[PDB]
Amino acid sequence: TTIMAVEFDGGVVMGSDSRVSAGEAVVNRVFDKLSPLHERIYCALSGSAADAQAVADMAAYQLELHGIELEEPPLVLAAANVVRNISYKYREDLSAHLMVAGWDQREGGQVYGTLGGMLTRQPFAIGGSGSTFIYGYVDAAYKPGMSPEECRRFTTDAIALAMSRDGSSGGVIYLVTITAAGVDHRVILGNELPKFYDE
Amino acid sequence: TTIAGLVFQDGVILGADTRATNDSVVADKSCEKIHFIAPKIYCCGAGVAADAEMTTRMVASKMELHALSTGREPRVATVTRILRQTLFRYQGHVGASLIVGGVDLTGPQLYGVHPHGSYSRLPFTALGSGQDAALAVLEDRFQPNMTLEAAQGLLVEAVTAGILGDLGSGGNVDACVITKTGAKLLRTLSSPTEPVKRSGRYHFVPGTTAVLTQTVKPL
Amino acid sequence: NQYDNDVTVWSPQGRIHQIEYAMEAVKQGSATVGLKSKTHAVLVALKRAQSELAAHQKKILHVDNHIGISIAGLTADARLLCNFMRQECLDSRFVFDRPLPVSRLVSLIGSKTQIPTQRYGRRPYGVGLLIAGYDDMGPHIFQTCPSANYFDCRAMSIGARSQSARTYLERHMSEFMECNLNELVKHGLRALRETLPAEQDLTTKNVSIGIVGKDLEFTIYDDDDVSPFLEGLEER
Amino acid sequence: RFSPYVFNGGTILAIAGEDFAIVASDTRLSEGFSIHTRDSPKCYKLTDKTVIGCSGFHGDCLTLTKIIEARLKMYKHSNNKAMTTGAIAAMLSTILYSRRFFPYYVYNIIGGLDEEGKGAVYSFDPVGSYQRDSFKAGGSASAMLQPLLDNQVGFKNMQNVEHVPLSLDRAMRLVKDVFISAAERDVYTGDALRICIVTKEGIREETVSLRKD
Amino acid sequence: IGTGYDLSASTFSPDGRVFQVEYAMKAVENSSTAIGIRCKDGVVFGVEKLVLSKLYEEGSNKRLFNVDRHVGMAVAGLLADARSLADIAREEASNFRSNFGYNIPLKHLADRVAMYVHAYTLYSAVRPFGCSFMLGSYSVNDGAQLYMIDPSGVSYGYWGCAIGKARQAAKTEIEKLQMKEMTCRDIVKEVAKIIYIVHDEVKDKAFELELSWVGELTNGRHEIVPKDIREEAEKYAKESLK
Amino acid sequence: GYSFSLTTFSPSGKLVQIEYALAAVAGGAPSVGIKAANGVVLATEKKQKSILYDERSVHKVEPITKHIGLVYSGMGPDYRVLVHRARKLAQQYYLVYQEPIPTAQLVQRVASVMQEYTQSGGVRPFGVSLLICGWNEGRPYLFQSDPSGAYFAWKATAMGKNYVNGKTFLEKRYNEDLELEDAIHTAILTLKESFEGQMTEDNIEVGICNEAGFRRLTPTEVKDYLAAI
Amino acid sequence: DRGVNTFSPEGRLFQVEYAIEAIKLGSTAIGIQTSEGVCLAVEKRITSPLMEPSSIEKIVEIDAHIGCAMSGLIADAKTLIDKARVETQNHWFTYNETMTVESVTQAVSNLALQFGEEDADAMSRPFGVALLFGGVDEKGPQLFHMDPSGTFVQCDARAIGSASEGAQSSLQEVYHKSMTLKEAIKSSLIILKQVMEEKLNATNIELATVQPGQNFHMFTKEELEEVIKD
Amino acid sequence: TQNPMVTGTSVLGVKFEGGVVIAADMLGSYGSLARFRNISRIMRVNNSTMLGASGDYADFQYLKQVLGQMVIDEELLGDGHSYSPRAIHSWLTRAMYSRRSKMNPLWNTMVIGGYADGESFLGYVDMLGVAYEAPSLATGYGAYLAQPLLREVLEKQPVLSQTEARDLVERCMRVLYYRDARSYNRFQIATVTEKGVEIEGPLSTETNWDIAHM
């Protein structure tokens, strides 16, 4: 898997590949790893499929009731703490990383890391097996003040670059743009991926 | 096992073989791997036969209590969730790999549920030791909005490829077609092996077996 | 009539008669006086004898090196509360390696003793305490009651005839902060003796003193150890 | 796999005299080939007539020490008297055996006065077996100092020798000379020697220096 | 109605009432008056803390508490119940930060604590709290917020609020103020004036005034009103009475 | 909770709370059960207070499993508790034995729960009497379970308001050899004996049980039965 | 009805008040603390010649240096006696020493208001017994009294039971702090003879003396006869 | 935590005349990977105490949460009593030992610096409950590289000024960046004096690579 989130002025862009594997076998080649936790709050799934889906199901439930009690959309910090606490309490039994990003009236567009029960805000963040091969790329390619389109292009290029190199990553790139107005869903097909040196 | 699913223009087709194996020995030549959940929801089981049998039985029973209370036809999302949350809780020790297919107010759906509790909504899928032979046929010839006759044909071929290619699979192809109007359970829809014939002359003349003791209890 | 039986029953007046009945235990225990100066906290109490042949009951008990108490009421409830206090103090030194701040201990007593005032089949504590302590905020005198309410005091008296002692503490209140130990203890003895009958005086048998302060850990003086303080008293 | 123990070294030693008891220790605390601190004395004052030496895993040393400290206060409140040296020894055995299946990795040597005002030493193993001794060494250089205590303080292997009982002055000189030898040969012993002397008058502490390496 | 219908909170009277809660409300009405005012840049609390004995220390029986760094609580009623509710409220705020990583919103805290109160109004096993209390808070995002909970477990949001003996008399005096356009420095002087007016010098003994505030002036932190400002408000309160 | 019984023996030897629970039943809307030769009918008065009530929203005649059905007299909310419990009990049997629960077996299990509320601490007995119908071993069954936890197998019976008259009416009016088509007609005529007003397909509720399992009759089916009445 | 933990308008628990009244029905027992040891004496109150006098054990040994005299409900006392014996041996095990008389008295005393209905694990009512703990420790000979309120006090001389008022009056007139243990035994026997309805004899009463260097001793019939002779 | 994930390297500490200074790089490593090069590993506990942490970051964040709340809890009372640096060190020792005894340690090695009543405080606490005070501390690999330099200076001059202590810490961070293969040239310097705790960052030590031309 290769997951990625990028903050911009009015919100966030989140991306993921589409490969679900079981050893060297592709089980699902078109999985959408960008799972909604609330209207305007999403998480990118990685690691154990069963663990990631379980944590997402519980976080969306906790956040739904939290939102209805505060008579307000939950804060992205609250959604990040929700996921983080589950990942931390069960870190010995869970083997999943759920990146949390979205939008708020208070702090606007924010990107969070939940790796092993930790919590960290990032201008952009990457995860999954595929992220290992694009650290140098994202370090060279990231520039602050990127537009939502520039964020989608940074996310698409970085994920395609990882998809080529990583056996556990491939398929299609799913893009999601969370903003005050709402959420936009894009899909970049395996035919339409950006091309780079592949020999 | 070779279990498979498909989503066609008017519903879902579920396919299964009839082999149960006990360590390289065929124990059953014709078992039923396609199980009822609700009138318009069926499930294929692969793995530890007792785990597939009991987790299908439990969710079917939970769906009867669901439908009786709600007064509505059950949703395929409910069977997927009830199954996942149960399997996840057991952490993969309940070895049931399932293909859930069905039709509700939101159309036809096909899901793959794994023993650890992970799931996927797919247009076609295959599970079991012969899943790769079936998944090759499905990848090779699946087109969206297939006709019932075209979908049945592809499904039979997908299960058959697993029957002949996987040593852990054999027997006949059982199928189930699920449409808005209900489900048609096509048992032994295809038999890739013609009736096995022998020149069996193994008759024993009465008395050939040496008997030491004989007691007769009238009933 | 019907609002007397349980602590969970509110009377139509917005009163809890069981709490009021438990407070009657404190008023029936023998007088105790607690007072403080800028450096010390003193506990002076009268010890009753159940016959000439019996001994005068222990009215003052140790809680920690910086805290000591004097009881009035059910002696079994006083022991229960004493061991809770002693233990809370032990926990604080085990965990933090510092004395438990006196006001914090008193909050735990108020929190601990309120619980049975709101639970059916349970009863309030039939004990009232005077607490003497010393910490970073100097010396303290606190008062707890069978009603889970507590008070920060400049001086105080609980028990039988304690109204007489309270009057002396209110009239001499101003002199207490600049008092030395001998004078502060004597003030305590005079308030204690005001409760005592007209025919009865203080004694090296019925008097008990507890002192904690700037350099002194909580110490209990009882018979010949009490004599130096009584040797200053002079009148009525 | 996580190990809940680590060896922090250090040497303890006690001697019971006619009217005194000495409990002594080095001040080194280490781990592996590193020195944590050079000022870590292993002597802990429990009562005005009882001192304890503790050595082994420092985490267990700190804990068993706070538990002993808390238990004495509890006993004083319950009995309105200080625990005698014998009652502290008997109690420590039960505390150590309460962890029979997850031991306190601590070597304890109690030293103080008995009810006759004489010297008392009680030595323990991590799991709670103890006995009263004339003298004893524990900790990293335990095996270096014990044979010399057996010889010079117990008069062992010496025929035609006048058995003169040890005086405080003579025992203090022996503690200072054995810790110098322990610091020369045992890597875990050094920096300084902290000596606790228990007499009718109370506890005195003396601190002599040992090698910094 | 003394016919058994008033001995338990798990028993309704024939006219549909729970008398155990009504008798618990009477314990607050018998107690000293506490007032709270919400203004343009914060919330201010004031309490008529009657001096039961000259022997007690200045600041004994504090009827004002810090429930969280940004939340304050003003009580009236049975003090041990009031302090037990302060500990519940405190833990509720503490548990929100541990769950969501930020300060508990005041309406949410009011809602949570009001339901721990409500819970004690349903059973024979437990007794309702003989207490009413106010919660005050200020943040840039939520603004100034004042809430009040009664023994029944009811929680409402207020611009001005009073609880205790003089609850109605203090209300007709708070109504004279145009608090929606006032500062906390301005409203402090008024809170003291209202407490001195509703105090009964004949029936009651001496009193001590407790003043606390949370607003923009304090950076959203619940604080006691400093000695300097308190003396100035008490001087104006006494001068206005004449 | 309250750990002591709330139903105790009066000095005369009566379990008075059970007697008072039976009074709640005797004041409820009437219900009828008729065991035909080839099936079972369950009929009840579903007359609500006003036109404003959505009659189609809640039911009195309820399914338990494919072959068992239910009706009651008394406390509506109490009934719902027993319906859920009965449906659950029917699944527990099916999960173990892989066979539809025999009606005597369901009735016995449910009746045990009813007995429990007459002895267990701090609870009152159910104010409901249930008519349970089923089809098993190729034959129809009609049972009744009352607030004490006692069960009875009936050929035909009445519960609720005017049950004494309905029970005499059933005895004389019809007997064995009834076709299910004849039995439904009789159940509706038994109900017409107590009913105050015009009896429509929205104020009466019928359920049938036969070879094809149990099912509630549609209002159009009830309308055609009422066309002959 | 009212709960067992209900307070009377005077500030005392009704159940504890009534448990004290039960002691007024029990056999009269006396204890005298002397410089030479503590003396314990009790009337058995035998109701039939067929009853074995040896089977009435109202004076018990808690440990070698501590004895106990009891009055009230004899069966309620048996539970607290065992709690006292267990306590001394758990203290011996943990600390390698004997307990003070006061420490044992305090241990038994902690179990007094440990009764209740709601929120408990589980005594329903208090113990209808009064105890006298006579023994020797480093503080010398000590005699302690305890009642169902958990209140324990140290006594020079104390009487408990039916004729408590009268026996204490007699004790008060004859007790001196310098009185010998021989005189202590004589006074207790004379005072016990006075208060009982039946005549006094070696098989009618129990006598025990705890003295430093002699330990706890239960007087034999032959010893009781020699004492009654004087 | 039986197996740490994101870990922090050495935490440095040295007391001076009038306070204590503590230093730590802002790196969280996942094995050899410098995964987070800008995370703070230092925390202001209260006005007199500050804590730096080596080992697992998720466990440090958890302790930062638990401590942070304890401070808030205390401050609501406003009774004129506050946790001394020594009391935070005592609590933290009991906290680590307790988790270690349940065979579920918090994978950290921490340094606590403080200043209360004119006295400087510097205490070490590890995942097993081993605690002690020292004039200078260095956790992890710093116990091999930086502790010899701190002790070398403290041997010549035992009392250091705030400036001398600060320059000594900058010299130690330069050595650690050269020698520790799990360090980063981004760090924080936190100082506690009469005024209170002051955390400074991000800092970097200038590097010299002239030895490459030898």
Ligand SMILES: *[B]([O])([O])[C]([C]C1=[C][C]=[C]C([C][C])=[C]1)[N]C(=O)[C]([C]C1=[C][C]=[C][C]=[C]1)[N]C(=O)C1=N[C]=[C]N=[C]1
């Ligand atoms: B990814 O490679 O990390 C992917 C992410 C993921 C998360 C939630 C839900 C899904 C699909 C249901 C996928 N996870 C996987 O592909 C993992 C295997 C994996 C994990 C880590 C690195 C590489 C590969 N898939 C499973 O665990 C799984 N899927 C199907 C059947 N059994 C197990």
Ligand SMILES: *[B]([O])([O])[C]([C]C1=[C][C]=[C]C([C][C])=[C]1)[N]C(=O)[C]([C]C1=[C][C]=[C][C]=[C]1)[N]C(=O)C1=N[C]=[C]N=[C]1
């Ligand atoms: B299949 O080959 O994976 C098969 C699935 C199966 C078998 C019989 C009935 C059902 C109904 C749901 C399903 N599983 C087996 O044959 C298993 C052994 C196995 C396990 C994993 C991979 C391949 C094969 N066999 C049994 O559990 C079994 N065999 C005979 C009788 N009882 C049980």
